């Protein structure tokens, strides 16, 4: 939760998270960062074990029954604005629901969702390319057109669309006047983003990784008490990276779930040892190093090696897979180069650059490289004179 | 498809693949394949270039397929080797201690794709039948492939004296006739290095038989690791109360 | 050059066998006669790969020597590496 | 540096004479690597007559 | 020397150990855009008239 008034604010790109939690192992200076008021993260029970192999490298396996209860389930607000204006002498822009017959440039997106004044009412789902703001500009060429009788199309359509592949429900719409005094409208579309197997989670210790896979509460390894890890991270993360304070937080916070006190992580104490923690952990009936006996989830059998579980504080990151995904087949094309557009929002093509064409001189593939730099991109024909070599 | 990650430093960073279509949103690739591309899974991305004609698609297939590029011209070593949990599990799977009952052999053999249909005879027939990890791993090793490497902990005093071939610690690795006789596997045998048990496969057998070699180690030793599991915990970063005194008296000194 | 005195490897370089199975599969993919008996094959690359092991492909490879000359090897005369 | 090493060598290639020649036909090597063998199939070995 | 291309796609990667070496998971919406032109013959015309 970034600011507490966010329901009033209109900002492009506002993430927010349903269920934040203040940590269970907390530095004593977080009180002056006001991190109990606006916490970003949720505690999670974290096994450190190699389980099915999907959590290898930096990935994370998650519990899918947790993700169904609101865990790391967030909201993404996106905000659009369009400004009516008076530019030419006769040329005015207006908010209005365009008609196919009078308006000129039109697309097959549904315009039935626009109101009488050409603005979606809030609470109306719109997917990519659905029309948020109908805006027509009167075409001054009608004046430029002389004796053209009554031109079929007097009005050109400037209407603004949802960004492609952005689905969501229109949350709020507002209509005001800007500096100049023209009508001005901001519109806030939102969509709830459930953590997928592409999304990106990270602890406080520098351990970042995607989601490998989601097993349901059935399939997760459970303790003797029926506690199943919300999140399982690979043990190989630790040895070369050497974040041990990640191992003590899972330890310090398992005493602080039991005792009911919120532990003290502040960096320099000498009053907190791994040895003074463990003696508090042995009193609640756990192995003092935090290891705990687990049963395999699929086959029921115990897992030979004891697994290290504890509550740990993870953050969900602005980086999600739905916004990084892209695919290109024969789309828009640049004006000057007649090559594919740049960027994901434009349905643009990915760059096949220098280093790549030097790897396929290595492979010795000439016909993949001529197709990749000629046929897939702009093909073209010229007529060349034979005597001079110049074009004809 | 041809499949890329920037920057492409050498030519193993563009390798042709064979599509399999799965749900959700992310490209998915075997973990041995993360060695050439130098890509770990935290927010990475990789391009995909789908070749558009049978004539350029038969170049990828016979030139750039990943099973063809196993061995690099640079250092004349294999590029791809066993990585992460499986290379930890192999070692724990291959010790003398590991004895798999009849129920846990039936599952492992089920993940061998090259398995010839015959359940091998247990190492210990009586009182209770028990297979060994070296006995099941010897069904993975393809063809008749033969190697002698040495384990990392192998002491130097061992090769010289008595117990050369009995190997008290089970360090020396021998593979005779496609059967793992003795020793523990590690980075120096399954990993990428000249002469590793993987590099002898591609050389002696071929690029096709060595594709089924990686996929068997990973599937039968990942589905075994659900029995043992693995972890790091605070109990493993801690020494004796006697060792903490020897570490200080050296510092004060 | 003459059929005598040809100096080139008799083996088929992995670049030639990549462009032979590509060019042959492109012909098969357009109504082209198939030299070998095909059994349950709707895929041209598998058919063209099959013609190769039987040495039935009707292509002669023209190898340019670096000095400007050339040699013509038929796909039967060459020795398939794999 | 990776970009400079490629642009200078990019066109050197093993011709059908097996002589390595750059783009002009000028001879860089009479045989590739002086033994004329692709580098992916070689291994380490001891001579055992030496020493 | 290099240029933006069609028939390309980019997304995150995550492990599937159940695949072979040479396979790759490709999601259905990235595999729905990218198309492969296929020449009709008497062999596949039964399959392609359905597609």
């Amino acid at each position: 939760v970034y600011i507490t008034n966010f329901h009033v604010r209109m900002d492009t790109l506002a993430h927010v998270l349903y269920y934040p939690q203040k940590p269970l192992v907390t530095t004593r200076s977080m009180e002056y960062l006001r991190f109990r008021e606006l916490p970003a993260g949720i505690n999670s029970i974290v096994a450190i074990a190699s389980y099915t192999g999907y959590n290898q490298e930096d990935s994370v396996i998650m519990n899918r029954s947790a993700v169904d209860r609101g865990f790391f389930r967030s909201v993404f607000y996106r905000s659009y604005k369009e400004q009516e204006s008076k530019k030419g002498f006769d040329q005015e822009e207006v908010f209005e629901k365009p008609t196919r017959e009078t308006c000129q440039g039109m697309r097959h997106a549904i315009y039935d969702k626009l109101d009488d004044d050409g603005l979606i009412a809030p609470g109306v789902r719109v997917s990519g390319d659905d029309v948020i703001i109908g805006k027509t500009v009167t075409l001054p060429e009608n004046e430029d057109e002389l004796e053209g009788t009554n031109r079929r199309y007097t009005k050109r359509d400037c209407s603004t669309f949802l960004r492609t592949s952005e689905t969501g429900i229109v949350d709020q719409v507002m209509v005001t006047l800007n500096q100049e005094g023209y009508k001005f409208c901001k519109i806030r579309v939102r969509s709830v983003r459930i953590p997928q197997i592409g999304d990106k989670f990270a602890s406080r210790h520098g351990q970042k990784g995607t989601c490998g896979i989601q097993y349901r509460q059935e399939d997760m390894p459970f303790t003797c008490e029926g506690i199943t890890p919300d999140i399982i991270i690979n043990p190989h993360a630790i040895p070369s990276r050497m974040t041990i304070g990640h191992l003590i937080e899972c330890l310090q916070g398992k005493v602080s779930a039991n005792k009911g006190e919120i532990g003290d992580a502040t960096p320099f104490n000498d009053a907190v040892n791994v040895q003074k923690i463990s003696n508090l952990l042995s009193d609640y009936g756990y192995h003092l190093r935090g290891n705990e006996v687990l049963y395999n989830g699929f086959t029921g059998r115990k897992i030979t090696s004891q697994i290290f579980i504890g509550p740990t504080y993870y953050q969900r990151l602005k980086h999600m897979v739905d916004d990084k995904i892209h695919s290109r087949a024969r789309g828009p094309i640049q004006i000057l180069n007649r090559q594919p557009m740049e960027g994901r929002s434009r349905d643009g093509g990915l760059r096949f650059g220098e280093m790549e064409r030097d790897c396929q001189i290595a492979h010795g593939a000439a016909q993949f490289l001529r197709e990749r730099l000629f046929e897939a991109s702009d093909p073209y024909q010229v007529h060349v004179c034979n005597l001079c070599g110049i074009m004809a | 498809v041809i499949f890329n990650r920037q920057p492409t430093l050498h030519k193993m960073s563009m390798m042709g693949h064979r599509v399999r279509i799965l749900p959700w949103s992310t490209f998915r690739l075997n973990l041995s394949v993360t060695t050439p591309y130098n890509a770990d899974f935290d927010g990475d991305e990789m391009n995909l270039h789908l070749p558009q004609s049978l004539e350029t698609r038969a170049e990828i297939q016979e030139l750039a397929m990943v099973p063809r590029m196993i061995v690099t011209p640079q250092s004349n070593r294999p590029v791809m080797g066993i990585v992460q949990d499986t290379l930890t599990a192999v070692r724990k799977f291959t010790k003398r201690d590991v004895f798999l009952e009849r129920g846990e052999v039936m599952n492992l053999l089920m993940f061998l794709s090259t398995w010839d249909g015959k359940v091998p005879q247990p190492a210990i027939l009586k009182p209770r039948p028990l297979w060994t990890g070296k006995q099941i791993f010897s069904l993975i090793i393809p063809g008749h492939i033969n190697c002698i490497r040495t384990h990392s902990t192998h002491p130097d005093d061992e090769d010289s004296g008595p117990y050369k071939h009995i190997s008290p610690g089970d360090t020396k690795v021998v593979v005779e006739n496609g059967e793992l006789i003795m020793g523990i596997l590690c980075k120096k045998s399954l990993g990428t290095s000249a002469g590793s048990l993987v590099h002898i496969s591609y050389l002696e057998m071929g690029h096709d038989i060595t594709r089924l070699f990686y996929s068997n180690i990973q599937t039968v030793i990942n589905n075994w690791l659900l029995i043992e599991g693995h972890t790091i915990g605070i109990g493993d970063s801690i020494a004796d109360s006697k060792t903490y005194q020897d570490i200080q008296n050296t510092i004060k000194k | 050059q003459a059929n005598q005195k040809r100096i080139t490897t008799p083996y088929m370089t992995k670049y030639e066998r990549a462009r032979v199975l590509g060019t042959r599969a492109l012909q098969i993919a357009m109504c082209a006669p198939v030299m070998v008996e095909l059994e349950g094959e709707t895929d041209p690359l598998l058919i063209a790969m099959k013609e190769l092991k039987a040495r039935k492909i009707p292509i002669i490879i023209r190898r340019y020597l670096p000095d400007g000359s050339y040699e013509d090897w038929g796909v039967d005369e060459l020795i398939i590496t794999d | 540096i990776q970009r400079r090493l490629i642009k200078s060598m990019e066109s050197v290639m093993v011709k059908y004479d097996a002589t390595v020649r750059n783009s002009i036909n000028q001879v860089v090597q009479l045989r590739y690597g002086e033994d004329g063998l692709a580098g992916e199939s070689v291994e380490f070995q001891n001579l055992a007559t030496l020493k | 020397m290099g240029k933006r291309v069609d028939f390309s796609a980019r997304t995150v990667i995550t492990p599937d150990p159940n695949l072979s070496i040479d396979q790759v998971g490709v999601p259905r919406s990235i595999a729905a855009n990218m198309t492969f032109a296929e020449i009709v013959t008497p062999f596949n015309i039964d399959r392609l008239q359905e597609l």
Binding site: - | - | I59, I60, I61 | - | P42
Partner: peptide
């Protein structure tokens, strides 16, 4: 480069043999 070094020609004499359905 590789795959481009040589040139393919169609052998006209060999096409006259083999049982050919299409």
């Amino acid at each position: 480069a590789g795959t481009g070094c040589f040139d393919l020609l169609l052998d006209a004499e060999k096409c006259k043999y083999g049982m050919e359905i299409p």
